[PDB]
Amino acid sequence: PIVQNIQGQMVHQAISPRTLNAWVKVVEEKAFSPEVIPMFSALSEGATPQDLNTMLNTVGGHQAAMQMLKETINEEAAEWDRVHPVHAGPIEPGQMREPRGSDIAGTTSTLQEQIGWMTNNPPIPVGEIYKRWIILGLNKIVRMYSPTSILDIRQGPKEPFRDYVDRFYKTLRAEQASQEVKNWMTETLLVQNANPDCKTILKALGPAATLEEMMTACQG
Amino acid sequence: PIVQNIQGQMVHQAISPRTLNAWVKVVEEKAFSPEVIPMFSALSEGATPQDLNTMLNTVGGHQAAMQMLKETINEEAAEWDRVHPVHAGPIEPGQMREPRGSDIAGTTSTLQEQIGWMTNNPPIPVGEIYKRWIILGLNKIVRMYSPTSILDIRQGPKEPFRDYVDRFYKTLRAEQASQEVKNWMTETLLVQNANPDCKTILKALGPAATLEEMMTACQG
Amino acid sequence: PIVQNIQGQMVHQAISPRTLNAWVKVVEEKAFSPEVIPMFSALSEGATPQDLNTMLNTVGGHQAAMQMLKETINEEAAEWDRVHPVHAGPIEPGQMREPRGSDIAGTTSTLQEQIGWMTNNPPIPVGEIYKRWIILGLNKIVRMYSPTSILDIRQGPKEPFRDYVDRFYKTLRAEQASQEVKNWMTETLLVQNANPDCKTILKALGPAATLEEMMTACQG
Amino acid sequence: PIVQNIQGQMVHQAISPRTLNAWVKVVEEKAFSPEVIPMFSALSEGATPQDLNTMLNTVGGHQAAMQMLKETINEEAAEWDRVHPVHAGPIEPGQMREPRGSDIAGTTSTLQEQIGWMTNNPPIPVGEIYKRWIILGLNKIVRMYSPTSILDIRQGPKEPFRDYVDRFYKTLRAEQASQEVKNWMTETLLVQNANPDCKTILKALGPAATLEEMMTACQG
Amino acid sequence: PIVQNIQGQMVHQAISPRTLNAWVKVVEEKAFSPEVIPMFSALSEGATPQDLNTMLNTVGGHQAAMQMLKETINEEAAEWDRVHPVHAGPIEPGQMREPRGSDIAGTTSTLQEQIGWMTNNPPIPVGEIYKRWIILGLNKIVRMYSPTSILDIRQGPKEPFRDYVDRFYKTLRAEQASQEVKNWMTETLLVQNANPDCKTILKALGPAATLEEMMTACQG
Amino acid sequence: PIVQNIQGQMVHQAISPRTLNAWVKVVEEKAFSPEVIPMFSALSEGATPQDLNTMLNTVGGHQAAMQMLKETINEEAAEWDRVHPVHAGPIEPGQMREPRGSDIAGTTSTLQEQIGWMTNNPPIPVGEIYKRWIILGLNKIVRMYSPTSILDIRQGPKEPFRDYVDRFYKTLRAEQASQEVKNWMTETLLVQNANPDCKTILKALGPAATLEEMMTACQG
């Protein structure tokens, strides 16, 4: 990827096999969950678009999500070339061509062009935009892969509350809902769909109950 | 994490793959124990708030503990904002603004902001404050994750004394309390729930004796 | 491969033992997946023909596929030698001789000649041409290795649509077709070889629908 | 630990996660062999007291040995405070204050104070004294771990001499004695608890013989 | 291995532990395979004769093959000494003496001698000659270690054709022969020992046809 | 250990845990074989005597060989201090003390003294002499660990020739015999202690048989 030396000038570096080996293993080992997006965002930090394309191509299985993210990239590139028209026909000497919809992803562009684009003054954050698009695609994917909705989460008669609230927060984190509605529902749906005895205990405890108080009361 | 070294201090390197892979693997394998607190403190020595956010997002499972940690961090940030109010009006040129309560968590801040806040003269230890917040969160987590209390520990007729005291000290380390009462409770609880042979041995030895003599007394 | 030292001249670095260990391991571990080919493109970035030949020959097993790819390499070298004439005479400094088919293949060439050919101005992409030939051979072998043709996959009565489209895309990645007609298959056969219920659902929704919404409609 | 950059000033480098990973894994896997303390000496070469504290706290289980080593650390700190007086007053530049036992232990000190103490002229080996205390505690723990004493091992009728002397030296590495008396022990107890036939063989050969010729005579 | 790089070329680094460990693993795990010669050529690219000796001494088991390699190296060194006699009399000052037959194997030479020989002007490639000796020895070893000859290979009624041709080409690669007879023997041996159905198919296809059509003909 | 930088000036480096773990695994994994001495000579190349002492003290089990190597080190040190007397009483300014019998091993000498000795002009190869002494000790150890002598090898009625000759060459390489007597006995003991049918077949070939002929003829 891209590393910074103590001298001050950075150079290009090939993709290390350890990162991709971990990336192939993490996708297979963790399957699909909310935690995959951050790992992806932290592992591919400061990498060329070709590296991300190879990582998205070296994955084994789940080709449906790969086609989903490819169509998302295509739609984002179409919107980009629609909202950003090429008003300048000729190119000034010493300046490289503007990244188009197909050039921002690296389909018909070599690595040298991407290097010259990212090392420009000022730099063109093509890799950052590609990472944001991939993060949006992964958000859509994990939203589609939801086993169930948030309203269907109901604690059973004998199921413990720990795994119940764990699954609740797991299916809530992958939801595309905003922070406000999530904070609104986490105070009501957690107590309305709990064990009846515990539910009554938490309701009698007061309307200002926190996480630790609920954990200590619902287990007694 | 930020790197302070020889000439060329203006550098920022992302989280290494070996560190992040090790932390996710160790947390899943070790589940939750008091031990994780020092491992996290050693792995995040002088790290940026975004690095801490990525490390907290890389963990898979146990969503309830993560929500508890997040709400504790939010409460402590609110307390910090209440005790350290921000000054109104225009800011002085060249002087970096003080970090707000929400800026410590890294939810409404960027990389350059925390870089300038950490490399300022004098530096602002916001990363240390966030690490202390996460340490307090992990303390609350390991306190609420306890399966058996400290008073329900009794050695059986065939359980060894060494394993008994090992379990007792593990349970005591899992709980956080003042050491001034710990010194009394360990002595008033260790020599009470032992085997009758070890009990009469320690009674013949003396209450004010050390622990190594008790270990080497009833051994075998 | 070829690397550039910090503020230094272009020097040739040796083969990567850890990368080769991974490459031999991946083939055995991953059996023969289509994603293996990108894997080669990511591991052999800027590699020399000698390194590529060593990586090909170090593979244990698949001797039939090795013979097939060697035959394809020989055919490509013969076609190159037929389309490009060969000239002989004195070699002027700063200009290299005309590379032959066996020279592009690297069987009758040496490391110093390969370095002189790849570090000339303008550079002769002999390594790039050999890598393209190798990936074309691997594409041919993965096309022949397909157990099921692209037109032989049909959704069963109890097979989920997710697994159906996953297998369809996996077979499309391994089938032989051009990039333009590649969309025709995934646009027509994907809906023409599905379960009748979701067939009628997609027909009522609209053919121009995208994969995400068509799957969300087929799931419900 | 402390490292010296090439043609650079003495700077403190951060801790290595792989070292703690190897250290946590080896102690759990190898239980408590005498060599473990030696292993400790190689992993903690020139490390700060905070690093040793984190390495000791990160160990999972065996809280009894941790309490014992903490008690030994407290006793050593009290002895150091009793033998070395403490002075207070203005701190002159270039000269550090009098290190206290609580500061030698590193529980009530920070990182910069230890860095200034270890990089002063003349350097104050606080880390070396703490490492010596820790290895003494580990020696005490491995002595308590010895199931069989040095005088309780005897060669059986069917046990070979090789395994006998191996277990004898393994127990001698775990007993409490000085080197001067350890020489006499390994000289006389090796022949005092041996097999009678090999006892007579060694008596005919001579007590001053080395272990190699004694073993070669006992095998034949 | 020798390190030819920027200023400071006078440097000799020992073999890295990771490469030696990988060599030990690939020797222990796979025994001897037709692909071990490229593995040795890649792992020992540009190494000093002492490095080759250390690599050949760390081999585990198979002492007969190592003795065969040693005696072949000795015979070839004797042949080199016979064809390249050493000049008698005093040597010229400043001119390094030519390496003798036994000096190439590193049995009667030192490190400084071979360092000066490989870094002389012009350099003397004794390491390449020793690598050629070793790969010839390995070819003799893999030819001697052959279980089944090439004529005793017959496909059963149920064994697949792909596995049959894979085994055939593996046994053919294990044996070393001239290039002008192998292309004839493969064609005169493959289309005779196939399944009756596949035999009739290939008879309907044609003798002078390629191999890919034979593979895709009787598949399934 | 000791590494060489690109600049030209070398610095001290602590022992890496990976090499120590690999050595421990090799010792645990293969017990003792004549092949571990080259492994130790290639793994600890250019290491301080303290590193070798830690590696010899961190090993678990087989304390007899450790006592043997310690006694050999003591005897070599005694011989060194006997043959090298200290004729120079005073020490010149800027010059370090001469390594004595106890200083050459590192028992009563710190690491700084060893660094100053090895980096002197001219350097004092204390590490090389210590490595030679350890190699001699390991030679004595593997000579003592000989299951049996070289004369007891006799091929049974049904035992194959491959494993027979492998064990023969293994115990020959592990033997303390010189190069001449080994080559003298490898032509006689191999043919005189073989299967009678094969033995007569090989004797009917002549007195100029090679290893490949012995392998190919005995197996028929």
Side-chain angles (χ1 to χ4, degrees):
Chain A
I2 295 302
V3 296
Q4 183 67 206
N5 195 20
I6 60 180
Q7 302 293 338
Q9 187 271 347
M10 41 78 59
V11 299
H12 180 271
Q13 183 180 359
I15 172 65
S16 59
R18 191 63 178 182
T19 56
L20 56 89
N21 318 137
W23 171 234
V24 166
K25 285 173 188 175
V26 64
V27 162
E28 170 194 1
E29 288 149 355
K30 269 301 175 180
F32 271 111
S33 53
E35 295 85 357
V36 77
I37 298 181
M39 183 176 282
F40 187 118
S41 69
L43 182 60
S44 60
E45 179 67 24
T48 62
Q50 183 178 1
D51 298 329
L52 280 76
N53 295 329
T54 53
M55 291 180 60
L56 295 176
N57 293 330
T58 48
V59 55
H62 304 272
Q63 300 292 339
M66 314 311 161
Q67 185 68 20
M68 289 174 59
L69 59 86
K70 182 179 181 180
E71 295 180 0
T72 303
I73 289 294
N74 296 330
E75 184 270 349
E76 292 292 337
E79 183 179 359
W80 180 270
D81 62 60
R82 182 192 64 87
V83 73
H84 292 106
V86 175
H87 59 270
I91 303 299
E92 293 177 350
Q95 184 181 0
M96 292 61 63
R97 60 183 61 89
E98 301 179 0
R100 289 278 73 185
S102 184
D103 300 330
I104 192 179
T107 61
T108 177
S109 300
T110 181
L111 184 59
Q112 201 280 336
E113 295 180 0
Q114 301 179 0
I115 293 179
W117 293 349
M118 67 181 181
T119 56
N120 194 77
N121 39 10
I124 301 300
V126 175
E128 303 294 335
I129 298 179
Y130 195 84
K131 287 186 59 184
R132 293 177 182 179
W133 291 357
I134 296 303
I135 288 179
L136 295 179
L138 292 180
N139 289 16
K140 181 63 62 180
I141 290 169
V142 302
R143 186 236 68 90
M144 187 198 68
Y145 270 88
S146 59
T148 179
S149 181
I150 187 62
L151 302 179
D152 301 329
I153 300 297
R154 294 182 179 181
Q155 182 177 356
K158 300 298 298 180
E159 278 67 20
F161 183 80
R162 181 179 300 180
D163 53 74
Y164 160 76
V165 71
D166 180 70
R167 179 183 178 182
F168 187 91
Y169 275 100
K170 179 181 180 181
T171 189
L172 185 141
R173 182 180 180 180
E175 186 180 0
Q176 45 78 32
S178 59
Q179 184 72 18
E180 293 177 350
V181 59
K182 285 185 301 180
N183 296 333
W184 169 83
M185 67 175 59
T186 188
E187 303 293 338
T188 60
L189 193 55
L190 271 178
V191 71
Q192 290 292 150
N193 291 15
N195 205 38
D197 49 357
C198 162
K199 169 182 177 180
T200 54
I201 289 299
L202 292 181
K203 280 180 169 51
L205 188 142
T210 176
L211 283 312
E212 48 273 8
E213 291 179 0
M214 290 181 180
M215 297 307 176
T216 53
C218 202
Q219 68 180 0
Chain B
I2 184 178
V3 177
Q4 295 292 346
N5 58 329
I6 53 181
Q7 308 290 334
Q9 59 279 8
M10 294 300 293
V11 290
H12 182 270
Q13 183 179 1
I15 174 64
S16 58
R18 183 177 301 179
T19 303
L20 47 101
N21 198 203
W23 155 275
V24 161
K25 290 177 180 177
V26 298
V27 298
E28 169 197 8
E29 179 183 7
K30 294 295 181 180
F32 268 74
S33 160
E35 183 178 2
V36 308
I37 320 176
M39 176 63 65
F40 167 81
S41 181
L43 292 180
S44 59
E45 293 179 0
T48 64
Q50 298 183 182
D51 191 11
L52 295 174
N53 292 128
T54 53
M55 291 180 61
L56 292 181
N57 296 329
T58 39
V59 60
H62 303 270
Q63 301 293 341
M66 302 307 302
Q67 179 67 22
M68 292 180 59
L69 178 135
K70 181 182 300 180
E71 72 95 34
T72 52
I73 289 184
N74 295 330
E75 180 180 0
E76 198 159 359
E79 294 291 347
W80 174 266
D81 193 12
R82 180 187 61 89
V83 71
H84 280 48
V86 58
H87 58 274
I91 59 180
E92 293 177 350
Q95 299 291 151
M96 300 296 102
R97 53 183 176 91
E98 299 181 0
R100 206 171 57 91
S102 182
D103 296 334
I104 301 181
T107 60
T108 177
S109 61
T110 62
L111 189 67
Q112 301 293 338
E113 296 181 1
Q114 68 89 14
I115 285 180
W117 293 348
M118 186 60 60
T119 59
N120 198 20
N121 300 120
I124 301 300
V126 55
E128 290 84 343
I129 296 301
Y130 196 61
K131 288 181 59 180
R132 293 178 181 180
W133 293 2
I134 303 177
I135 286 182
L136 189 145
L138 293 181
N139 290 319
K140 287 189 176 180
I141 289 175
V142 302
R143 277 180 284 185
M144 64 88 57
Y145 255 97
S146 179
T148 307
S149 60
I150 195 63
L151 300 179
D152 300 330
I153 301 180
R154 296 182 179 181
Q155 182 177 352
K158 298 182 179 181
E159 278 67 19
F161 182 81
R162 175 189 172 275
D163 298 332
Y164 159 76
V165 300
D166 200 335
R167 173 187 176 183
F168 182 86
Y169 268 99
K170 180 180 60 180
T171 306
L172 181 59
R173 185 180 181 180
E175 189 269 350
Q176 301 292 149
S178 57
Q179 191 259 9
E180 52 96 3
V181 297
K182 286 178 59 180
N183 300 335
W184 175 85
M185 69 90 60
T186 183
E187 301 279 44
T188 55
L189 197 52
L190 262 177
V191 299
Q192 282 71 15
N193 300 332
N195 297 130
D197 301 330
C198 304
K199 278 196 295 292
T200 184
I201 284 180
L202 58 84
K203 287 180 181 180
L205 291 169
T210 176
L211 182 127
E212 54 181 0
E213 70 100 29
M214 301 180 180
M215 295 300 300
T216 191
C218 212
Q219 54 87 15
Chain C
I2 170 65
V3 295
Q4 180 179 180
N5 192 270
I6 299 298
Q7 300 180 179
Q9 196 179 181
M10 294 300 293
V11 297
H12 172 262
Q13 198 264 323
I15 194 57
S16 181
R18 182 178 61 181
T19 306
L20 203 156
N21 175 359
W23 166 219
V24 49
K25 292 194 171 188
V26 58
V27 176
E28 161 203 1
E29 293 177 350
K30 265 288 184 178
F32 200 64
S33 74
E35 295 85 357
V36 306
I37 294 169
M39 181 61 61
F40 177 81
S41 180
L43 295 181
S44 61
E45 290 286 348
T48 61
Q50 179 182 359
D51 293 330
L52 295 174
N53 295 329
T54 55
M55 292 177 72
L56 291 175
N57 298 330
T58 190
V59 171
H62 304 270
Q63 300 292 338
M66 290 300 168
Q67 180 68 20
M68 293 180 60
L69 62 87
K70 183 63 62 180
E71 291 179 0
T72 60
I73 287 297
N74 289 275
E75 292 291 340
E76 293 291 339
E79 192 274 342
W80 177 268
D81 194 12
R82 183 180 180 180
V83 69
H84 282 89
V86 180
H87 299 269
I91 302 302
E92 293 177 350
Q95 181 68 21
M96 301 301 178
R97 61 181 181 92
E98 207 293 284
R100 208 183 178 181
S102 182
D103 300 331
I104 299 298
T107 60
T108 56
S109 299
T110 177
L111 181 60
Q112 49 272 9
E113 284 180 0
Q114 290 292 341
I115 291 301
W117 295 349
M118 71 180 301
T119 56
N120 199 20
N121 181 270
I124 300 300
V126 175
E128 189 273 344
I129 292 180
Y130 193 84
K131 179 179 178 179
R132 184 177 182 179
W133 292 356
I134 290 307
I135 63 182
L136 288 181
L138 294 180
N139 290 323
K140 179 182 299 300
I141 306 300
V142 79
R143 288 161 181 179
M144 184 172 296
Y145 206 86
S146 58
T148 304
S149 180
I150 182 60
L151 302 178
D152 298 359
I153 170 64
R154 294 181 180 180
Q155 181 178 358
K158 283 79 181 178
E159 293 177 350
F161 187 81
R162 299 181 180 181
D163 301 330
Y164 161 73
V165 69
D166 199 340
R167 186 175 295 101
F168 180 81
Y169 289 159
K170 184 178 181 179
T171 54
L172 177 63
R173 187 184 298 267
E175 295 302 320
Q176 45 95 5
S178 62
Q179 185 67 21
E180 287 75 14
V181 197
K182 184 179 181 180
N183 301 330
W184 182 87
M185 276 80 72
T186 184
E187 282 179 359
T188 300
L189 192 66
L190 181 58
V191 77
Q192 208 267 337
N193 279 14
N195 212 36
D197 50 3
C198 287
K199 276 184 173 180
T200 56
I201 288 182
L202 299 194
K203 289 178 181 179
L205 180 61
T210 189
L211 185 64
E212 303 181 359
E213 62 184 331
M214 83 174 58
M215 287 184 303
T216 57
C218 180
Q219 289 175 10
Chain D
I2 172 64
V3 295
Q4 179 178 180
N5 190 270
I6 166 66
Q7 300 180 0
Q9 196 180 180
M10 301 297 299
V11 297
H12 176 262
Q13 195 258 332
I15 200 61
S16 181
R18 186 178 61 180
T19 301
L20 279 309
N21 200 339
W23 161 247
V24 46
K25 296 192 172 187
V26 54
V27 290
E28 151 201 7
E29 289 183 351
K30 268 203 167 301
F32 258 105
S33 295
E35 71 281 5
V36 305
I37 294 169
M39 199 98 66
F40 181 124
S41 180
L43 294 181
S44 60
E45 290 286 346
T48 62
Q50 180 182 359
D51 296 330
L52 279 71
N53 294 327
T54 54
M55 182 178 301
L56 293 179
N57 297 329
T58 44
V59 181
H62 305 273
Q63 280 68 20
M66 297 301 168
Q67 181 68 19
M68 291 185 57
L69 62 86
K70 184 63 62 180
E71 291 180 0
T72 59
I73 286 296
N74 297 331
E75 293 292 339
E76 292 292 338
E79 192 274 342
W80 179 269
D81 205 332
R82 184 179 181 180
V83 69
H84 281 89
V86 181
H87 298 270
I91 303 302
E92 293 177 350
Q95 180 67 21
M96 302 301 177
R97 62 181 181 91
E98 207 292 282
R100 200 181 179 180
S102 182
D103 300 331
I104 300 297
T107 60
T108 59
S109 297
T110 178
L111 181 60
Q112 50 272 11
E113 290 180 0
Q114 300 181 358
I115 293 302
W117 295 351
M118 70 182 302
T119 58
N120 198 21
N121 181 270
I124 301 300
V126 175
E128 188 272 345
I129 296 179
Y130 191 82
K131 177 182 177 180
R132 185 176 183 178
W133 293 355
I134 293 305
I135 64 181
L136 288 180
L138 293 179
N139 291 326
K140 178 181 299 299
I141 293 302
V142 78
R143 290 194 304 266
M144 179 169 294
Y145 254 79
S146 61
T148 304
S149 181
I150 184 60
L151 302 180
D152 299 359
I153 170 64
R154 294 181 180 180
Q155 183 177 0
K158 282 78 180 180
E159 279 67 19
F161 187 82
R162 298 182 179 181
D163 301 330
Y164 163 72
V165 67
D166 190 10
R167 185 178 295 101
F168 179 81
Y169 273 92
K170 183 179 181 179
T171 55
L172 184 65
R173 290 174 57 92
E175 295 302 320
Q176 40 180 0
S178 59
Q179 186 69 18
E180 293 76 18
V181 69
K182 181 181 179 180
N183 299 330
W184 178 83
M185 289 297 180
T186 190
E187 283 279 42
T188 187
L189 267 305
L190 180 59
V191 77
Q192 222 284 326
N193 289 18
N195 210 36
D197 51 0
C198 287
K199 274 183 175 181
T200 56
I201 289 182
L202 300 193
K203 290 178 181 180
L205 179 60
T210 181
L211 183 58
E212 299 181 356
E213 53 190 334
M214 286 186 175
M215 289 182 301
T216 57
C218 181
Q219 290 175 14
Chain E
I2 182 180
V3 181
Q4 186 67 21
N5 59 329
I6 57 180
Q7 186 271 347
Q9 67 283 353
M10 294 300 293
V11 50
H12 179 269
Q13 182 180 0
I15 174 179
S16 59
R18 200 170 191 176
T19 303
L20 183 57
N21 184 24
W23 171 263
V24 170
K25 291 180 179 180
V26 77
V27 168
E28 173 190 19
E29 177 185 10
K30 289 187 179 179
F32 275 66
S33 170
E35 49 81 26
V36 304
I37 289 87
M39 176 70 66
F40 167 79
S41 181
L43 294 181
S44 61
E45 179 67 26
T48 60
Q50 181 180 0
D51 190 10
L52 295 174
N53 292 129
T54 54
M55 291 179 60
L56 293 183
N57 291 330
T58 51
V59 61
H62 306 273
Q63 302 294 338
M66 301 309 300
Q67 179 68 20
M68 293 179 59
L69 173 60
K70 181 182 301 180
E71 68 92 22
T72 50
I73 290 179
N74 296 330
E75 180 181 0
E76 199 157 0
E79 293 291 348
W80 173 267
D81 193 12
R82 180 187 61 88
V83 71
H84 280 47
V86 54
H87 58 274
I91 58 180
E92 293 177 350
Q95 298 291 152
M96 299 300 180
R97 53 182 177 90
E98 299 182 0
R100 206 171 57 91
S102 182
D103 297 333
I104 303 180
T107 60
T108 177
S109 61
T110 62
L111 178 61
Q112 300 293 337
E113 296 180 0
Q114 59 189 22
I115 283 182
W117 292 347
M118 70 179 181
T119 57
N120 198 20
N121 300 120
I124 304 300
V126 291
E128 282 70 16
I129 302 300
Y130 197 60
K131 289 181 60 180
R132 292 177 181 179
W133 296 359
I134 297 177
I135 64 179
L136 290 179
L138 291 180
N139 293 330
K140 293 186 178 181
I141 288 171
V142 302
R143 280 179 287 182
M144 192 275 298
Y145 268 90
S146 181
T148 308
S149 59
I150 194 63
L151 301 179
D152 301 330
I153 302 179
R154 296 182 179 181
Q155 182 178 355
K158 197 60 63 179
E159 281 68 28
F161 182 80
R162 179 169 297 174
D163 300 330
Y164 163 75
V165 299
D166 200 334
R167 172 187 175 184
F168 180 88
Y169 270 95
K170 180 181 60 180
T171 54
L172 181 60
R173 183 182 179 180
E175 188 269 350
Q176 271 64 23
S178 60
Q179 191 268 355
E180 54 102 359
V181 302
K182 55 179 300 180
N183 301 330
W184 174 85
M185 70 91 60
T186 181
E187 298 278 35
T188 56
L189 198 52
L190 273 176
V191 300
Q192 286 75 8
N193 301 271
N195 298 126
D197 301 330
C198 303
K199 279 194 295 292
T200 55
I201 289 180
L202 58 83
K203 288 180 180 180
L205 296 171
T210 174
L211 187 131
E212 53 181 0
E213 68 104 33
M214 300 179 180
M215 294 301 300
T216 191
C218 214
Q219 53 87 15
Chain F
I2 299 179
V3 298
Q4 181 68 204
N5 199 81
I6 312 179
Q7 301 294 336
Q9 189 272 346
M10 44 80 59
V11 296
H12 177 267
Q13 183 180 359
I15 171 180
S16 60
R18 189 64 178 182
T19 60
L20 199 154
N21 290 131
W23 166 257
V24 169
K25 291 179 181 180
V26 168
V27 170
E28 166 191 349
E29 293 177 350
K30 278 205 166 189
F32 274 102
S33 165
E35 67 206 28
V36 311
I37 308 176
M39 174 64 62
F40 182 84
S41 67
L43 180 61
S44 59
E45 179 67 25
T48 66
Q50 182 68 21
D51 298 329
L52 280 77
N53 295 329
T54 53
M55 290 179 59
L56 294 177
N57 294 329
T58 189
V59 57
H62 304 276
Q63 301 293 338
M66 317 310 164
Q67 182 66 20
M68 288 179 61
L69 61 86
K70 182 179 180 180
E71 292 178 358
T72 58
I73 288 295
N74 298 329
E75 185 265 350
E76 291 291 338
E79 181 70 26
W80 181 270
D81 62 60
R82 184 194 65 89
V83 75
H84 292 107
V86 175
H87 59 270
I91 303 299
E92 293 177 350
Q95 184 181 359
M96 294 61 62
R97 59 182 61 90
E98 301 179 0
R100 289 279 74 185
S102 184
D103 300 331
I104 192 179
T107 60
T108 177
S109 299
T110 181
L111 184 59
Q112 200 280 336
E113 295 180 1
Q114 300 179 178
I115 294 177
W117 293 349
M118 65 184 57
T119 57
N120 199 20
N121 39 10
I124 301 300
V126 175
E128 301 293 335
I129 299 179
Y130 194 85
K131 286 186 58 184
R132 293 177 182 179
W133 291 358
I134 296 302
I135 287 179
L136 295 180
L138 293 179
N139 289 319
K140 182 63 62 180
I141 290 167
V142 302
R143 288 162 184 178
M144 187 200 68
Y145 265 89
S146 300
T148 182
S149 60
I150 191 60
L151 303 178
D152 300 330
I153 288 89
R154 292 182 179 181
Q155 180 179 356
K158 300 300 296 182
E159 279 65 23
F161 181 81
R162 181 179 300 180
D163 58 329
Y164 155 80
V165 71
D166 179 70
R167 178 183 178 181
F168 185 88
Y169 274 108
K170 178 181 179 180
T171 188
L172 182 60
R173 182 180 180 180
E175 195 181 0
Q176 67 283 352
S178 59
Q179 186 65 270
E180 293 177 350
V181 61
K182 283 186 300 180
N183 300 330
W184 170 84
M185 68 174 59
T186 189
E187 305 293 337
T188 59
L189 300 180
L190 278 180
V191 73
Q192 291 293 148
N193 286 17
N195 206 38
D197 48 358
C198 157
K199 172 181 178 180
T200 56
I201 289 300
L202 293 169
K203 279 181 168 55
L205 186 142
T210 59
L211 281 310
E212 53 274 9
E213 298 179 359
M214 298 277 291
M215 292 300 300
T216 54
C218 263
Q219 66 180 1

